[model samples]
Target chain A: LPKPTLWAEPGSVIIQGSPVTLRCQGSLQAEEYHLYRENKASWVRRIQEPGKNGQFPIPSITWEHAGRYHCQYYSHNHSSEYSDPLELVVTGAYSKPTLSALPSPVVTLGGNVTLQCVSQVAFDGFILCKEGEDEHPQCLNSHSHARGWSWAIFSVGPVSPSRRWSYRCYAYDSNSPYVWSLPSDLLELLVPG
Target chain B: LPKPTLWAEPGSVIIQGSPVTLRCQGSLQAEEYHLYRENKSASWVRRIQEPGKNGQFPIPSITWEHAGRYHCQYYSHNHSSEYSDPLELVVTGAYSKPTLSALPSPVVTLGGNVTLQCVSQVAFDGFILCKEGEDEHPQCLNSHSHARGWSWAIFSVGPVSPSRRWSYRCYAYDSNSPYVWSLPSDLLELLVPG
Candidate 1:
């Protein structure tokens, strides 16, 4: 079996929600290669006829993407063992923001409530998303005092007895149009009669 | 992390098309258990509500797909047990019969070579070439994997002499489950010209 090595391109300090690629190379010719993640029981992906080097891509990195990875090749009727491990660290420009509901997440009918997203880092844009909502993210407010910290508030009034939703938030720098921080932890909004 | 142990009931040598159960046990109390197979890329199959330290997983029927190394783990909340030692499952008596024949006619001139080929509808890791009237045991030949699950292995025996006539047969076995061999192929008689 030929020794194989794995490496991440453009460095391993990956930004959450950004694309990343990993490549595996071996000395001997191989018709198929299998990628594996540390602590995972099975190969993560199998590439056939991937040439001397195999490249795997992740369209969007997430918290779960932070881990060690390895690769191997298959030849004849057997498979070569895993290659050297590659450490992958996923991060965002800012730490995760906190999402909370005022008064309580559970609300009585026809009551007003406020959902807030707070960040220690100054952000120029804020987006609020509701789980299972077909609508795109909406930025209710982008107000900032330039204190290296920011917060966004979303108001919900005249709550219907039958309406309930789960919510999360994302913060972004005003200068970066397409870049956004990792989403805040989920908060379920419940409106009861 | 709590370590779990996995074992199959009635031994790991299972009969093809028969049912089998795998049990995973650990000292830690876990609400869910995960089962993983070797080489396969799919996520582990999760079983919930397995009381105490034991979780039972059952397979209705065993096939070639059921043969491989397997491990188990138990998890709850933020804690998870370490994976158990892998157990290998071997299945037998499920492959289709193979056909054998001599290449370019069975009759060969003296000092000429004759080749025998065995073809099977099922995939096999190795093929055996057996000849009658030889004190030596049949030699096993490793075969390469083929597409369409149809494998063909060729054995070339040469230097034909009219002094003796030969009969040949072939059999195939899977590498994962080597304990059982497929039924022998149809006999082939070689004619040697003077």
Candidate 2:
């Protein structure tokens, strides 16, 4: 059997209360399709819909539905290799975290800076987002360093002083990588020529 | 006479070398469909031959040459309909990003107006103001390289409401290649009264 391809319609990162569809395409002949979440054994499974691609649609999305996912197809009593991991992030779940730069927000052109997120709640991971580039926001699994504090840092950019860059951060639980906290306050990074 | 509606599959904005389809839908009587570019013309424009109410124009692998504003219209035999509302095809990463800013602030109330500006260090022929992931095309203005030797475009936007959720990004492109565009600027979101 051949590996199938999985992708989300609209996009992988979505707003809370929005609709999304997961599509499993490739290798037309298949008996059944199975969807699996990372770290979990079994999930909702569906049979092939003749004349149409295998799809799972969520009309109303919630936090518990967020996480990394992959799909596999069973054809003629044989199963294909698992499809590549597909990240499903339902954003704006919890209250926003705080975002700030490590050393300074200002730096030399083409320089790199460390961006950090601090939250009052003990989140298991953090996601960093740059304005305008939502297609691929960076996510990092995190841990609690203190009793009431949770945070994560990300190294960003070979700085472009040409334009002021904007950054925001979100918090998520380890098991709920698909759900995201409300966006942190916008943090501006400056790279002066 | 019925006008056709045009939309891009995947989205209006796409990464370079990605596959995309431009779909034109409307009255079922359409015999031929035509796609047009703003000011100039499409890299590949022609009469679609398939007999259907909607026309699907596919770009196997998109490139800078396939970027720009587009509109579609269809005709039966003797009568041609008016052009559809324009849709924009923006191909990103042709150049570095610009910065988008609001004149007074990034916050506003229902029915309030704001001035949005797109600025870039590089001299560009023009600028495009877009509501991120939205279908409506925006009207804007651009000035020649000024005091700081930078390029800028000003857009008057208004009575902001959810239409709701006001988030925007701007793009800059050289005149030599109007279809090709730079990366989008940082998002400029308007905090509006709920």
Candidate 3:
């Protein structure tokens, strides 16, 4: 029979970006142990130093850090019982913003229309874009202090059979300029005959 | 075409014990509005009042309070645009401790060994079942701490031969008491050589 029994503390499911501690205890002559993430196959390393008491700590964990974990200890001449595997699940980060058009079907040339760009993601810098038109799309005036939110209204100047227009949006953080997020779906406002 | 639009702030995915707010916006007219929780028919009307700027706020925090998916809307006499459906995933608390009772089986006899059990939900704390047999049983002389995460204990009793005439079973959580009992095993006696 195995003399010492093994187990893990605070078993499973830890929040992302938070610190976690792992403790291993049992009655074995083994010295140091190897801890491995079962799913990743690539995340294997020594968990603790050789001693009676053992503990490992990881600071600021992320999504890719989640998976099954187990440990094996080594002694002078043999190996100790393997600790049962435990799982760890990490949480996701902030969601992104999106753009929507007033009239989905099509817009008349010289008619009034509104292009709405609203984002649930709380951030500072945001910009609206009309691809192929300007090098750096038009910046929609956003009022952080307004009762709710500020809207950017684009009035179709005049109607012309040959003229066509389509657009999208870009959002950013305070320190960076236009980072993250893909351009919105293609939207074209065509003039009628 | 619809004039005004509706939306949510700070995204969805409300934690089990946290506050949440929903906002709706529109231009035409919203006569009567309602809130709905996905996968469920019941609606929280009483807690849905005091609609400010077409928004609803769930008070304090709750465990069973509005679990699963949720969405709200605005309705008028003539026109109403369906708002997008969103998830309201919530993280719950630790699992509850299971109610335990002994399973019926044959009575244990002397000289023979038997196993006892205490049932509980998986992941919950394990249990220990102890009995005082004809033979000697360990005394609760000192504090005994568990090693592995396993919250259970099993005591392998004896082959009752005559001297093992005492009652048998094991102990549970109470330091001074044993909660369950196994029917005494059949008695064993020694015979003289012919």
Candidate 4:
């Protein structure tokens, strides 16, 4: 028996509160299909006869619904094992913000450089993170007074030329501290001595 | 600058839905700490200045999503130390073994319906039945909503046939937790008299 395959429509990484469909597909002519989350043996959804594919819809996705999942089908008094696990990550607050570096990603050693994060959505706060440099996110919540489109700028000064660093920014709502928008495109900062 | 070390309180292997605390310790003077999840480069949780050089991040109820590598860092002022070594955590489902048995007799005539009962002391969300030595996946039989101390499920397979000799087994599991599975029941040898 061929193992079934599971996937999420619109990709696995999706914005929170948005609708996403989890599709389970199989090659055999099975009447019923069961969807399972992670490694547990219990079935999350049992779809009966539409075709070989079973579609599970989530009207509004959340962090709680984010995890690895798989599916299986039964045919001819036999059951097929689970399909490959699909990892689903649900981002929060809204869409991803565009991040850009002022002047250039290449900055002069010991000189100040500015990083800007621009978003069309009205996010209440922004956080700047330099990969592997500091674990804590440098947040700028005070500058989010704008009711419409907003942008936040982060300044980094006197960067050492000894090592290279990559940076990304995220936007979040003031009320939902645990939830955050998807990470912006990576901006590599090159410091030339 | 002293390096901070992060470790799980219960040694990392925990049952799903149980709470576990990840503690980070550094020099006593360090006031602030930050916790980061692997692959999430754009964000981290910040812990304000506390008395000890330690910071604790609690996972109230852990799911498979919470099973991953984590790192921690401490800062006193302008100088922030690098992240501590990564800690890996695993979460497994908790349940009891299920018992499976034939309802009437192991032998049946052609076109006869075969009934199998799977009972579990643990409350499982559903049950699965499969033929022994078959490469086919297990078949799911939805639970009947009889919430008592122990739960039982009934599975019926269509008209018996002599086309092939079959041995069957069943398992129980909770739908909320897909990874954990109860032990398979004793094999039931189904015979078809010609």
Candidate 5:
């Protein structure tokens, strides 16, 4: 038994009102390929007759289309462990967040820094990214202290002055875990060498 | 006839009150090197012909008057070389900082194009965009300007990929003092996801 491989084209993060195709590929013969959205009753299945893959196209996607998704192939009356979950994030769901440094952008060499990102819309998570620093945009779980406002702080570096460091952030809510707000203003960390 | 090549140390554009060296390299059996300031008289500097076949004109602490086009020439046995190419010595920190932003979004597709916009409340005749670590000089753009100090310029950068961190800033400068520039804008990061 083999699991199906799922991937999205153009990417997992799509601008709203665009189209994306979630594709599942498999080598073994399968009766059908099923695309599943977690917590949702509606799942799409394409009957396969020795087909290698199936394509599920979503056009004019919106915030409602953002969530965890997976694909599985049913073969010989057996279902493989579903494909690794894909977080389909729909960006531009809300206004961008604002990012700032706690003390200042000017950093001392080999010292850590705190970066704060706040939003007008209450969010369940925040993702702070140092451009090309991380392999993925890791989301941090967030808790709001007030209605309609939320924030998250991330600690960055024992920074080295030898290189330029810059960052940005995004916000996403629990109700729409995969839906992200527009990116925050660019925040550059300056180290006087 | 071989022409002398003139260049600046640190950079041609320097912060005010900073020190910079204008260097002229010549291979001729030269006697003296003359450093000429545009719209100004010539200043003589001793030739350091040993280490590099060149002469160094050091400005100990630069000022606004030090900003402008410069040229250098070497004088050999009863003969003077043609003046070297003009080097625009820019002294920055003249205006307030502008703000830079990536258009459409900061998350760009690999090998795709992104437009960077630099905007300020103070009008500037020109704008410059620079990627961190790629020194030497910056990419220049003329303002598609509006009156009343809402001046702005947009730069199209890339055919890019996520192989490296793309950190950028923009600066504003007036045409009259093309060499002098404002403080750099806030950084704008464009992520080309894998």
Candidate 6:
């Protein structure tokens, strides 16, 4: 049998740092197929038999999930038709901010030194992120009510003598339970001897 | 008080190389006036002598003019109306050929080489060219041409011993007193050594 013409479309594309979804479509029967998110063929999402209309839906997708997603029809002969690849481009949310240290780049011990942080897009909400030994992140300090695609800055000046600290930030989206964003790039500040 | 609306009927346009006319109509009498042809300014053909209720027609015949957007104007001192200009037209005519020279390009004798060219619209039925000095006048060169626009040429490679001189001109009219012009091309010589 001749192969059917095939194509795919993105369900929705979100701005950077937001959730998105993409859907694959073609003439093949939905029951006899497997979908690949991209070329590596490593991550495959199996179809659950036919559901009413025989189509599938993907929800809340991320950039890592973006790529040449297509479907292959399964046949008793072992070979199947490979559909055309589709592309998805995801933009970066914002740039990493540098910490401003008082007494210049080198801080003197015993004296108080401040490290300043700034948010990229303007919003009242801010967070100061501290890293744990496991490398997973924890929010140490956060501003209240900064909603939807907003960034917050944390400033630490006047550090106590002999104090060394590491920090970052977590931004929150205002929707519902106050969705939180991934941790900011790591920031570490230390007092000089 | 308010700007006047401009308008026109469809399918009306200038024929190439021809003239076009425009008329302005309005409920009130218009005072100061101006006209525009696309990006170019159109000189006023005439102004309305009477005021209010009277309309005016402007006859502007332009030729081989550029193609473009056209608009016009109607206004009174301080208060005025704007009439969008209508497209004027200019149609193109047939191509023309230059006259042939009678004497050798350089009078100094034995001018080795000679070159000739004839240009004309292919629609014509005949072509005649001849040397200037001979009383025999002119003679036919070629006809029944299938090409639309064409040029003919004759060239001599080496220096001449002084026997041949060439002059030429071309005509392309099929009828009507035929725009057959008498002009001959510039003269040139071809020398062939024995």
How many clashes does each candidate structure show, in the order listed?
Answer: 0, 3, 18, 9, 0, 37
Residue A149, candidate 6: alpha-carbon lDDT: 24
Ranking by lDDT: 2, 5, 4, 1, 3, 6
DockQ of each: 0.01, 0.01, 0.01, 0.01, 0.03, 0.00
Question: How would you encode candidate 5's per-residue C-alpha lDDT over A104-182 as one tens digit per residue?
Answer: 3443221122334444444333333333443323121111223333332222212332343344333333332122233
List model 5 lDDT by residue over B35-111, tens digit each.
76644544656755434355678887876566666677777666778886654565555545545554333333331
- Per-residue lDDT of candidate 2, residues B1-194 (tens digit): 78676766555555566777777776765667777664555444456454564578888787766666677878777888998765556555555454544433444222122334444444433433333212322211111122222323223211121332323433333333322223323444443332
Q: What TM-score does candidate 6 reach?
A: 0.29
Per-residue lDDT of candidate 3, residues B1-194 (tens digit) = 14333232422322344554545444334444545554444664322233324544444564444544445555555665574343232322323322212112122111111112222323222121222222322111001122344232221111111121222211121112111111111221222122
The residue ranges of model 1 lying beyond 4 angstroms of the native Cα positions read: A1-193, B50-53, B96-194
Superior by DockQ: candidate 4 or candidate 5: 5
> Which of 2 and 6 is ahead in TM-score?
2
lDDT of 1 by residue, B1-194 (tens): 67776766544544565687777777545778777765443445655664574578888776666666677888866887788655555454443444444333333222122234443333332332322212321111111122333333322211121112223333333333322223323333333233
The true-versus-predicted C-alpha distance at residue A62 of model 1, in Å, is 69
Each prediction's whole-model lDDT (CA)? 0.44, 0.48, 0.33, 0.45, 0.48, 0.31
Badly placed stretches (over 4 Å) of model 3 are: A1-11, A39-51, A93-193, B1-194
- Whole-model alpha-carbon lDDT for candidate 3: 0.33
Looking at model 1, give its docking quality level: incorrect
* B2: Cα error in model 3, Å: 37
Ranking of candidates on TM-score, top first: 5, 2, 6, 4, 1, 3
TM-score of chain B of each: 0.46, 0.51, 0.35, 0.44, 0.63, 0.33
lDDT of 1 at A1: 74
True contacts kept of 4: 0.00
**Deviation in angstroms for B120 in model 3?**
17
TM-score of chain A of each: 0.43, 0.57, 0.38, 0.46, 0.57, 0.33
Q: TM per model?
A: 0.26, 0.34, 0.24, 0.27, 0.38, 0.29
